[PDB]
Design a protein around this ligand. Structure first.
Ligand SMILES: *[C@@H]1O[C@H](CO)[C@@H](O)[C@H](O)[C@H]1NC(C)=O
Ligand SMILES: *[C@@H]1O[C@H](CO)[C@@H](O)[C@H](O)[C@H]1NC(C)=O
Ligand SMILES: *[C@@H]1O[C@H](CO)[C@@H](O)[C@H](O)[C@H]1NC(C)=O
Ligand SMILES: *[C@@H]1O[C@H](CO)[C@@H](O)[C@H](O)[C@H]1NC(C)=O
Ligand SMILES: *[C@@H]1O[C@H](CO)[C@@H](O)[C@H](O)[C@H]1NC(C)=O
Ligand SMILES: *[C@@H]1O[C@H](CO)[C@@H](O)[C@H](O)[C@H]1NC(C)=O
Ligand SMILES: *[C@@H]1O[C@H](CO)[C@@H](O)[C@H](O)[C@H]1NC(C)=O
Ligand SMILES: *[C@@H]1O[C@H](CO)[C@@H](O)[C@H](O)[C@H]1NC(C)=O
Ligand SMILES: *[C@@H]1O[C@H](CO)[C@@H](O)[C@H](O)[C@H]1NC(C)=O
Ligand SMILES: *[C@@H]1O[C@H](CO)[C@@H](O)[C@H](O)[C@H]1NC(C)=O
Ligand SMILES: *[C@@H]1O[C@H](CO)[C@@H](O)[C@H](O)[C@H]1NC(C)=O
Ligand SMILES: *[C@@H]1O[C@H](CO)[C@@H](O)[C@H](O)[C@H]1NC(C)=O
Ligand SMILES: *[C@@H]1O[C@H](CO)[C@@H](O)[C@H](O)[C@H]1NC(C)=O
Ligand SMILES: *[C@@H]1O[C@H](CO)[C@@H](O)[C@H](O)[C@H]1NC(C)=O
Ligand SMILES: *[C@@H]1O[C@H](CO)[C@@H](O)[C@H](O)[C@H]1NC(C)=O
Ligand SMILES: *[C@@H]1O[C@H](CO)[C@@H](O)[C@H](O)[C@H]1NC(C)=O
Lengths: 1095, 195, 49, 49
């Protein structure tokens, strides 16, 4: 059950793109419940709806005649019902009864069950709807069960969204894997709380007699919040999709925004081990609150004696007091007594006294009147609570205890707590209130009656307490639990309020008796004393690191291996140790065969002992590749392997005390070198980029001062310099030499590297390959497999960007002007050699110019003229192999392609940061200016302006760095132009490789390419040799070259090319005597004069 | 390197280990001792080391016989001067200043990025658990926005420093790779370029 | 809260990954210029040197 | 402007690759219009001394 159930996410849709989005999609390869349904295996069972469902059925005649959705679908509350009349869909919102197989199928008069609506039977029809032909569209296709009706139902924001598609079927009870996309049909506003549903067969048993047909098949699968990448075509159609959760390859190609991936290692996500448990530790129990005084005095205070306090820095036993069977009543006005058992506060205020049983009615926090107002009533502003217990048995007396008097009225004491406590004739609001004279009065009844009085009289001792809540330190709390300790696992933990997540370990970390926990050199905490055991624990973080995917090209294989960076494989997954296959959907996006490296834990690759060159790099000398490994596995004999890299081919120079190796033959070579020279010249209208023509944003921007001019000054410097770079590399020629008619000098064929006038455009044939094989921002093209041609996007628009305040500007020299400078340099080089790089250009025959370039590398001139046929044939062949190479693959042009790709990523990141929220209510200025008043809109806009302006400073700073990095390559290229092309550099490996003969420049987009011509000696003899020779009395030494032995005879030769010559007075010089030199051999030096004296 | 791998910061291994680097230096020296310049341009062609030296003497414009007639003095001065390099490198710490500086600058940048975690940025604390326990959410988010903006400005600062320092090391690596091809594989005549 | 600022924690990782890959390019371009691994000679002493 | 956007019967308007709005279905009578920004740019002044 897979690749079903994708729908167009909304109505805003658009052409030819990869769009990555989050929604309640059906995740790929989840198990759908197939209700295979047949006669006795039969019913319409109610099913939970959850977050929404993919639903499908094998169908034609609308056998699934409808659906019912709601909380209950039968009683009290409204329900949505959807029914196929024989033509059309019916919708109602009514609270239907549906006690059985649902057959309340009564319908309106105009085409009953056929056109006008059905299920009329209920009591709250707040919505009703008639469709057109939405049951005939099912009935259109040929034969029942030979088609699948396919739907998504999702409920959010008070809307039921309905999407559908309808497709052919071959198996009457299966759900095929064929990809198709559902269209939206409805966004029903009905607001119903759907949590359950059922399909409707409405007592049907179809005349489509496959089984007698109290039977069908239908399918339910739950939607889940998942990230899909959706691929649109040029008609705005979804054509493909990727569930980014499924496996590490799906995650990779979502992260890369592509459906195809090249061979490489890619970073995709962070691994971060979750905690297994929780550890809470607190000290030995101590500092119990002094409640025994307030609560457990043997005889309590009278109403007027009223013992009272406030208490702090203590642990409250209130859980016990609440758990106590004693108290006749207790009430909290504040937060519930059930939580005061464990809650924390800055302090408590507490007091105690007595009442005749009746007056407990008035004493509470939240309660006031002339009883409590004139002997104890507290302010109702604390977390106040009140408790009562038996005075009737203890501190009562049978007369009524005349010491435990009644409340002492004093109407004028309006203030809380003061609420006249006092034993005084004081009852009025303001009369003189001495002792007993006729001005003033005292209620003086007895409260404390004994337990044999009626249950009204029966008096209570009473306590009130009042907890105080502040941001200040909570000096009172209920008791707190300590857990078991959990060593050697990632856990949550808490000491005395030092909370974290980590791995707790036993430790050797000695520290002083007064110290509770250790910091480290970073000043993060790393060790703690256990408050109960006094164990010295050491804390380290739970394992985390980058996750990287190792892949061949997806072109070649969809197998992948995964590297968890830096971690020990012991911490990594509860795996199943197959090579090749990650059980990834369930197991850690990964889940299989394991290997350890210093880079971290490597999964799914096989370790191989045979070394190879490094294909995909990993670290610490480990590399990976896609390789044949076991012929027993059929084509899957190719798997990902990991190995220690080979440094190079092993070799053994046979060092000899008296042997020298000298070349007998040579090979000409042509080597490409590719260099970047300039970036895309860019500018940004910062006031449009920030504000989008919001006038109010344009006002607020001015407060920041120079920035919008400063950034444009900086980019104008970078932009001007791209023309300086391009000018300094190419404009080294003094004069524009005309390209000659004859393209062929002394057998050497230039016709592929000069322009051709007979066949426009006006570039060399090799420049046409080079201008083809590069991708601009998304215009142009290049691919490493060799499977691409023609621009991937609009060229005069680069791909997009020219509409967001961003702009890109033309170069000063057009590509035709660059191709005119290379045509000038090559035609000058072919007709005049080094001379135009010093004086004026001097004509010289190309064969002679080559002989003097051979002479420059220490190969004597005659070697060229005697071999000119071979040298021309090797040159002409090597030029043709450059065309074959550039035609085959663009992998040589990677440097020029990268200059574009970095600039594309720089602009696309700068554009994406426009959409970013930055802690405003919205990233859209029209929202902020419509939803709010100006004094709030200013703060919202200021957050956007600050975010956007910081985003521009980032981009221009990246471009300053990148421009400086490109300038270093423009200066190096300008140097190679002067030294390699205009001359013959002797700097080893500066121009080409081997001995340097000459070089030709060629134009390329954003760069230059050099074709270096070099001479490589390539076959060698191995000769006996001597440092000097002794003739008569004296050592003779070679003027140039080496003395070597031909097996027969001693000869002298140049050491770049074996050319054995007679040893003579001409090619040797004398020094010293025969004894001085080590290992001098004894042989004749010939004299050209002696036979002429003998004449 | 201190502890490092334990606050989101991490340091990764190089591809070539020091034991692989030390194989390439041994290959380059033993090529230079037995085949001279030849393995740069062609394949390695074996040559007796005294004759290789006589041709390198001819390259500076001193006639070959000045070597052969003095070979004992020249070998003694060579063996002597190599031993002084070993003695000097045994004795003094100051010679490798450029390489120790590369370590020190990275150590300072990371320890600055680390200290900025403890910085307050005008919030009520630099600890998220203080903010999340002392306040209700409408206040807590604004106090966290101060820390997030502070910490994110500190990362954008650090990455910009490393981008500049990486270009400064690259300009040294390109020069060093050039001294390899010109000074080791050959006999470059550029005055005071090689020694 | 960190999601609201968009790209930056991806962008910073791409920049550090670029610098990190280049350290192997620098180290390779200096040392890996030799064509073949020439085995070190048994004799350490040549013509007196 | 009038446009060649082929966009589907349920769709109302198009976003570009950067997801700014680029085209719309006229709600009073269903033409497919395409929207481009009003002209903007740098001004530069060219001068002798
Ligand atoms: C999903 O699993 C159930 C049993 O849990 C099975 O009956 C059903 O056929 C499976 N789905 C499919 C498409 O086969
Ligand atoms: C939705 O309906 C179910 C079933 O009666 C009920 O448990 C749930 O609390 C309801 N939720 C709402 C938001 O009404
Ligand atoms: C209410 O619940 C009973 C349960 O037996 C059911 O028969 C009845 O159809 C439901 N609906 C109404 C509106 O009574
Ligand atoms: C219809 O629905 C409302 C709640 O939406 C309920 O109060 C009312 O009693 C219902 N009426 C009948 C007759 O079922
Ligand atoms: C777009 O839809 C039309 C429908 O006739 C079809 O002809 C065409 O091939 C489709 N694709 C493209 C890329 O135009
Ligand atoms: C108190 O500390 C001692 C220290 O030895 C320990 O044994 C005991 O378990 C602790 N008791 C409580 C109640 O924490
Ligand atoms: C003592 O403690 C009990 C149990 O919590 C409490 O109900 C009672 O009121 C207190 N006072 C006396 C005098 O027992
Ligand atoms: C006392 O507290 C415990 C808490 O676990 C509870 O199980 C018990 O039922 C309580 N008893 C009374 C008398 O409140
Ligand atoms: C890549 O796939 C194409 C077909 O899509 C095929 O022609 C080509 O040979 C493949 N190349 C490799 C190296 O896998
Ligand atoms: C990794 O875990 C193993 C135990 O499975 C342990 O022996 C080893 O020391 C740990 N560390 C490393 C770096 O391998
Ligand atoms: C050099 O090698 C080439 C290889 O094609 C061969 O044709 C030629 O005869 C050789 N030249 C000499 C002078 O040995
Ligand atoms: C020069 O080389 C090109 C290579 O394609 C060839 O077409 C042309 O005929 C050659 N001309 C001569 C005169 O050899
Ligand atoms: C080359 O010649 C020498 C004598 O000078 C001989 O000893 C040696 O074995 C030969 N080497 C090869 C590679 O043929
Ligand atoms: C070089 O020696 C060979 C045999 O090794 C001999 O045939 C030849 O004549 C000698 N060369 C010359 C120029 O005489
Ligand atoms: C090396 O050559 C010298 C003369 O140049 C000689 O004295 C010595 O014996 C030779 N070494 C060997 C191993 O033959
Ligand atoms: C060898 O040396 C002697 C004495 O210097 C000299 O006569 C002789 O000519 C030399 N040998 C040859 C073959 O020239």
């Amino acid at each position: 059950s897979s690749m079903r159930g994708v729908y167009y996410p909304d109505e805003i849709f658009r052409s030819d793109t990869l769009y990555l989005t989050q929604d309640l999609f059906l995740p790929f390869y989840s198990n759908v419940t197939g209700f295979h349904t047949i006669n006795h295996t039969f019913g319409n069972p109610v099913i939970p709806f959850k977050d929404g469902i993919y639903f499908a059925a094998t169908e034609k005649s609308n056998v699934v005649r409808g659906w019912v959705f709601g909380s209950t679908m039968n009683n009290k509350s409204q329900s949505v019902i959807i029914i196929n009349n024989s033509t059309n869909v019916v919708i109602r919102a009514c609270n239907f009864e549906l006690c059985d197989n649902p057959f309340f199928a009564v319908s309106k008069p105009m085409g009953t069950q056929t056109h006008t609506m059905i299920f009329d039977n209920a009591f709250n029809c707040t919505f009703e709807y008639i469709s057109d032909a939405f049951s005939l569209d099912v009935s259109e296709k040929s034969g029942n069960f030979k088609h699948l009706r396919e739907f998504v139902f999702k409920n959010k924001d008070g809307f039921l969204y309905v999407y559908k598609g309808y497709q052919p079927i071959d198996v009457v009870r299966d759900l095929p894997s064929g990809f198709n996309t559902l269209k939206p049909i409805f966004k029903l506003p009905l607001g119903i709380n759907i949590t359950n549903f059922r399909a409707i067969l409405t007592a049907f048993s179809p005349a489509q007699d496959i089984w007698g047909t109290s039977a069908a098949a239908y399918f339910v699968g739950y939607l889940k919040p998942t990230t899909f990448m959706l691929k649109y075509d040029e008609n705005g159609t979804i054509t493909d999709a990727v569930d980014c959760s499924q496996n590490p390859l799906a995650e990779l190609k979502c992260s890369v925004k592509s459906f195809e991936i090249d061979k490489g290692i890619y970073q995709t996500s962070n691994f971060r081990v979750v905690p297994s448990g929780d550890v809470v530790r607190f000290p030995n129990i101590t500092n119990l609150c002094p409640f025994g005084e307030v609560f457990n005095a043997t005889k309590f205070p009278s109403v007027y004696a009223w013992e009272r306090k406030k208490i702090s820095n203590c642990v409250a036993d209130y859980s016990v007091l609440y758990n106590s069977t004693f108290f006749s009543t207790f009430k909290c006005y504040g937060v519930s007594a059930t939580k005061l058992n464990d809650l924390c506060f800055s302090n408590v205020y507490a007091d105690s006294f007595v009442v005749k049983g009746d007056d407990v009615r008035q004493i509470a926090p939240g309660q006031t009147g002339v009883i409590a107002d004139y002997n104890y009533k507290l302010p109702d502003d604390f977390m106040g609570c009140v408790l009562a217990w038996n005075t009737r048995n203890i501190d009562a007396t049978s007369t009524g205890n005349y010491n435990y008097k009644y409340r002492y009225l004093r109407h004028g004491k309006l203030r809380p707590f003061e609420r006249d406590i006092s034993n005084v004739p004081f009852s009025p609001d303001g009369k003189p209130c001495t002792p007993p004279a006729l001005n003033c009065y005292w209620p003086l009844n007895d409260y404390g009656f004994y337990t044999t009085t009626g249950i009204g009289y029966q008096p209570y001792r009473v306590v009130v307490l009042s907890f105080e809540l502040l941001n200040a330190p909570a000096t009172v709390c209920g008791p707190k639990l300590s857990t078991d300790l959990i060593k050697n696992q990632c856990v949550n933990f808490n000491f005395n309020g030092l909370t974290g997540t980590g791995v707790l370990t036993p430790s050797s970390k000695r520290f002083q008796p007064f110290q509770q926990f250790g910091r480290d050199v970073s000043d993060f905490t790393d060790s703690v004393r256990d408050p109960k055991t006094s164990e010295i624990l050491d804390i380290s973080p739970c394992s985390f690191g980058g996750v990287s995917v190792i892949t061949p090209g997806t072109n070649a294989s969809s197998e992948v291996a995964v590297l968890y960076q830096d971690v020990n494989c012991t911490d990594v997954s509860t795996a199943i140790h197959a090579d090749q296959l990650t059980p990834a959907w369930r197991i850690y996006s990964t889940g299989n065969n394991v290997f350890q490296t210093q880079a971290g834990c490597l999964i799914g690759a096989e370790h191989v002992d045979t070394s190879y060159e490094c294909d995909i790099p990993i670290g610490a000398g480990i590399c990976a590749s896609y390789h044949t490994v076991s012929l027993l596995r059929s084509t899957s004999q190719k798997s990902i392997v990991a190995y220690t890299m080979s440094l190079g081919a092993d070799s053994s120079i046979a060092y000899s005390n008296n042997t020298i190796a000298i070349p007998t033959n040579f090979s000409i070579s042509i080597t490409t070198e590719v260099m970047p020279v300039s970036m895309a010249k860019t500018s940004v209208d910062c006031n449009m980029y920030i504000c989008g023509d919001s006038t109010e944003c344009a006002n607020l921007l001015l407060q920041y001062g120079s920035f919008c001019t400063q950034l444009n000054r900086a980019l104008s410097g970078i932009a001007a310099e791209q023309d300086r770079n391009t000018r300094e590399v190419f404009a080294q020629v003094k004069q524009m030499y005309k390209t000659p008619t004859l393209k062929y000098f002394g057998g050497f064929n230039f016709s592929q590297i000069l322009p051709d006038p007979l066949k426009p455009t006006k570039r060399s044939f090799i420049e046409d390959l080079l201008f083809n094989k590069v991708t601009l921002a998304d215009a142009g093209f290049m691919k490493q497999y060799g499977e691409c041609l023609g621009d991937i996007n609009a060229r005069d628009l680069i791909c997009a960007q020219k509409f967001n305040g961003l702009t890109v500007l033309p170069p000063l020299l057009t590509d035709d002007m660059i191709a005119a400078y290379t045509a000038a340099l090559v035609s000058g080089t072919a007709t005049a050699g080094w001379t135009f790089g010093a004086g004026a250009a001097l004509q010289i025959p190309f064969a002679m110019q080559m002989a003097y370039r051979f002479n420059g590398i220490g190969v004597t001139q005659n070697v060229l003229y005697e071999n000119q046929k071979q040298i021309a044939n090797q040159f002409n062949k090597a030029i043709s192999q450059i065309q074959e190479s550039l035609t085959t693959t663009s992998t040589a042009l990677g440097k020029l392609q990268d200059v574009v790709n970095q600039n594309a990523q720089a602009l696309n990141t700068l554009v994406k940061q426009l959409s970013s929220n930055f802690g405003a209510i919205s990233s859209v200025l029209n929202d902020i200016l419509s939803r709010l008043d100006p004094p709030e809109a200013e703060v919202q806009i200021d957050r956007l302006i600050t975010g956007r302006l910081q985003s521009l400073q980032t981009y221009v700073t990246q471009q300053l760095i990148r421009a400086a990095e490109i300038r270093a390559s423009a200066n190096l290229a300008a140097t190679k132009m002067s030294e390699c092309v205009l001359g013959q550099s002797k700097r080893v490996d500066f121009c080409g490789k081997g001995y340097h003969l000459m070089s030709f420049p060629q134009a390329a987009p954003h760069g230059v390419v050099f074709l270096h011509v070099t001479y490589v000696p390539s076959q060698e003899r191995n000769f006996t040799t001597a440092p000097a020779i002794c003739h008569e009395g004296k050592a003779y030494f070679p003027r140039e070259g080496v003395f070597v032995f031909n097996g027969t005879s001693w000869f002298i030769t140049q050491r770049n090319f074996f050319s054995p010559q007679i040893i003579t007075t001409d090619n040797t010089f004398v020094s010293g005597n025969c004894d001085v030199v080590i290992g001098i051999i004894n042989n004749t030096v010939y004299d050209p004069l002696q036979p002429e004296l003998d004449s």
